[PDB]
Amino acid sequence: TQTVSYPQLIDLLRRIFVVHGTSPEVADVLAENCASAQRDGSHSHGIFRIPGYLSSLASGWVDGKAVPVVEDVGAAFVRVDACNGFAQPALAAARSLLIDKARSAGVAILAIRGSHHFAALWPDVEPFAEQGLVALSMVNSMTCVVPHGARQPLFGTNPIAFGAPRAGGEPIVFDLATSAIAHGDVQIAAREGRLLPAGMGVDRDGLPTQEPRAILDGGALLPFGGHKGSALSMMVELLAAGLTGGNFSFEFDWSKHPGAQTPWTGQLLIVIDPDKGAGQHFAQRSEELVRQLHGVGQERLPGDRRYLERARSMAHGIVIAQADLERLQELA
Amino acid sequence: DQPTQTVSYPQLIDLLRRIFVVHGTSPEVADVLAENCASAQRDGSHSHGIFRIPGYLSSLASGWVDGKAVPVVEDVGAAFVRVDACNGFAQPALAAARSLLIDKARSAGVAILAIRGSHHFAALWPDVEPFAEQGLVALSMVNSMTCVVPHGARQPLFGTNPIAFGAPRAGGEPIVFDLATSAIAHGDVQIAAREGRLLPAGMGVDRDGLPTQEPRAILDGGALLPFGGHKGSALSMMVELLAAGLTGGNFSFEFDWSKHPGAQTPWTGQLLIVIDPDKGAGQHFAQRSEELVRQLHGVGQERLPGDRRYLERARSMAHGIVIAQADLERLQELAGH
């Protein structure tokens, strides 16, 4: 296993995206995102995703050269047509305007439509929290989750992410799928020949199963926390698709695009200046919550795992199997 | 068995209004709380219906909560409103800022209402429903008193911390959900303890951190578990940060009513986010949500979030609100009858 630096990995991935038809702008954005995921130990969202990115680009399913169109529609509202491109480039195109609105008006919404999101969600909220703002994001994906009480899948894994600043450390950030398990983890259990704990999914006949292969072979996933996670998943469909103008998780398919791996939906982001007109400092309040959490026994705070891995990567470099490095080099 | 009686929705509102006025609230506060409490009862939200009257009254009598507080509405940004509830209830504070909040939401596209120094002793869905009835999307969060053990922790810290959501649909009543981030709502634990029955397992623990189904064991030194596991705990933390951290109100563990015998209302805060889903849009949100409803029925989800309450609501308006004879007589006495 060879070791590559964070910036080295970025340049390598950027080359790959350029070679496969993305614009230089899109390549920069995706390379950094993917490399950041690897740096933080989010393997399921790191270099592991490259093949899926490229297979999706190959058919034109997702446009690696799309130019986001920003629409300033309100003192606290921004819409962006991702134009069948990735979501990250669209978010980047409107980020400055979004932050200006959030700081001026107190809160602002960014509604991205017609976008493909193939990464972790925490990278999208983290930057806002690093700048002292609170951010909430939702992205609906592709049909595979059975709504509570239903007999067939409808919702996507539909993740929700949240980021908030704290005076004494890195941002408090969490990113969770509303399904009981992430789709990527099901494939892993399948490859590793591992069974899943009860309640993660059902087979093609709608019967409970622990066999990841059964879930993948025409089966489906269940919502986390039963009716509660299901309600939250419905909210994600309504906010990331219904409000943005993008497709619901069931309003598109890959039947005409061999190799397509990305959902073609949308994304909602709500950015808030927690201290707008406040006689206190949110960051001090959150730091106190952290202190109290440690006090009752919670050793790890949401995000702690990634920050520790991040520190390791910046100090000793990112460790990657020579096999993967060579192929990435060949793709480059 | 306890013989029952029926009271119409308007009759119950009048009765509770009298109770609040007789016990020291301003007429504005009485109007707001009477309608809120009666609405919960009408919808079958038993944990937050008339069951809360005794607690409302003992909290008022102890001086813990100010029933005549006048909310101070603070216009702090084009899309941001804060309200100092002045140690009063949350609902009257929300009512005082409602018009301004809606104006900002429609004008700017989205707006936030940050209530601090408030007491919330009710269901959360009543707070988002009105916005959805008017074509807006609303999200709200409120924290309570400490009762939930964070994931991986040994002692309780978070409150029951519910999250509520309301959205309009072109062909029906608003889609609304109101879920506690605790495995079971704290209020339902109290109901179970009152009715002397056990709870389903896997929702709480006793003072020793051991599994229990006895509501009294949870209420007396015990604790509740976050729903769904680690994910529910993360959402509960978010509620503390949004309802208290951002508003200026106390976190669930930052208030003590030991000096106020009878105090039962959490003194914290509340966050509300109201959105015009169609701001600058080239489509209609209500049509999209109605399509989602159609698809949900198509895959087999017979009941949509909110349907349970709408069914009870219809039953209450048609046959009246069922109430234990003893409870009705108690309310009538409290009103002066």
Swiss-Prot record, chain B:
Keyword flag Oxidoreductase: yes
Lineage: Bacteria, Pseudomonadati, Pseudomonadota, Gammaproteobacteria, Pseudomonadales
Quaternary structure (record): Homodimer.
Homology family: Belongs to the LDH2/MDH2 oxidoreductase family.
Binding site for substrate: R52, T160, H186, G187
Chain's gene name: dpkA
Reaction(s) catalysed by this chain's protein: L-pipecolate + NADP(+) = Delta(1)-piperideine-2-carboxylate + NADPH + H(+); L-proline + NADP(+) = 1-pyrroline-2-carboxylate + NADPH + H(+); N-methyl-L-alanine + NADP(+) + H2O = methylamine + pyruvate + NADPH + H(+)
Keyword NADP: yes
Name of the protein described by the UniProt record: Delta(1)-pyrroline-2-carboxylate/Delta(1)-piperideine-2-carboxylate reductase
